[PDB]
Amino acid sequence: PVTLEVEARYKSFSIKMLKDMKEGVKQYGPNSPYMRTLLDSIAHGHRLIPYDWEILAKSSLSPSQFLQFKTWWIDGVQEQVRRNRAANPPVNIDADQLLGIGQNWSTISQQALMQNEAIEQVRAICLRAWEKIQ
Amino acid sequence: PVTLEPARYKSFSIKMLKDMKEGVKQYGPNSPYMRTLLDSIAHGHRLIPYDWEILAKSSLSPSQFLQFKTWWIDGVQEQVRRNRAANPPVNIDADQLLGIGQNWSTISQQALMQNEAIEQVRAICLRAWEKIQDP
């Protein structure tokens, strides 16, 4: 997660939290009330960049579950970019920022400068993607 | 939880607290389910004593809550003995670990707690939670 001291600083997830979450997904399922409670609290209790989401997902999910998450992340990005382009005025956030990739957004330091609207879009897209894991 | 390390505070969502209360109702405070969920939350967020109080009070029956608080205080008493006896001494007292008194009763004060104190609070409260008995 990113903290805004404004000066943005990145702090990695707790190793124990990650271990807890991987074991919880395994025992209860990625969308059990168990995981929904935990994940929602983390997502809304922190400023998460795409890097954070990639870490949470890759660490917590089985390989097949992770593939599902990524496809739905990409699906949510398609829809979001469409809404961004159609907004009046257009919202200048594209897929590179929402996925955390490319020359402008691939590094943690770049992503840490993401504005509120972008953070909110990433949060909604990734929570939806997680919820769509079957 | 505290949203900026030493600083400000954001409450748990009403929904999250409802889920925790339902989880305790369905599975009990010391199900592996609740134990690992609590552990996850406690390592996923920076919890001050005020958070622990809200979580416990919201999730537990009055008698379970009294047990939790009794064991939190007991664990604090043991931790303070250890802090005093440490070489060098750890300058963390019972009022900080419990979030009480002139120095620590407010969220604004608690939000300035450093890592060692947050960690001590976490260990003590997780242990106290485990000491709660079922109906």
Residue numbers in the entry:
A (entry chain B): 1 to 5, 21 to 149
B (entry chain A): 1 to 6, 23 to 151
Give sentences from the paper.
CA forms the capsid shell surrounding the viral core that protects and transports the viral genome and also interacts with host cell factors that are necessary for trafficking, nuclear entry and proviral integration. Further, we assemble particles from HML2 CArec in vitro and use single-particle cryogenic electron microscopy (cryo-EM) to determine the high-resolution structures of four different types of Fullerene shell assemblies. Our studies of HML2 CArec show that an ERV retains the ability to form capsid assemblies using the same architecture as exogenous viruses. Analysis of the shell structures reveals the intra- and inter-molecular interactions that drives CA assembly into pentamers and hexamers and their association into shells that encapsidate the retroviral genome.
To guide the structural interpretation of these particles at higher resolution, we determined the 1.8 Å crystal structure of the CArec N-terminal domain (CArec-NTD) and the solution NMR structure of CArec C-terminal domain (CArec-CTD). CArec-NTD has the same N-terminal β-hairpin and six-helix fold observed in exogenous orthoretroviral CA proteins. Structural superimposition with exogenous retroviral CA domains revealed the strongest similarity of CArec-NTD with the CA-NTD of the beta and alpharetroviruses Jaagsiekte sheep retrovirus (JSRV) and Rous sarcoma virus (RSV) (Z-scores 10.7 and 9.0) and the most distant relationship to the CA-NTD of the gammaretrovirus MLV. Importantly, although α11 displays the sequential and medium-range inter-residue nuclear Overhauser effect (NOE) cross-peaks that define a helical conformation, the higher T2, lower T1 and lower heteronuclear 1H-15N NOE values observed in NMR relaxation experiments together indicate it is more dynamic than the core domain (α7–α10). These high-resolution structures could be docked directly into the cryo-EM density and, with the additional building of the NTD–CTD linkers, the NTD–CTD interface and helix α8 at the CTD–CTD interface, refined well into each particle structure. Exceptions were the N-terminal β-hairpin that contains a large loop insertion and is more mobile than in the crystal structure, and the NTD–CTD linker region of D5 and D6 equatorial hexamers that displayed weaker density.
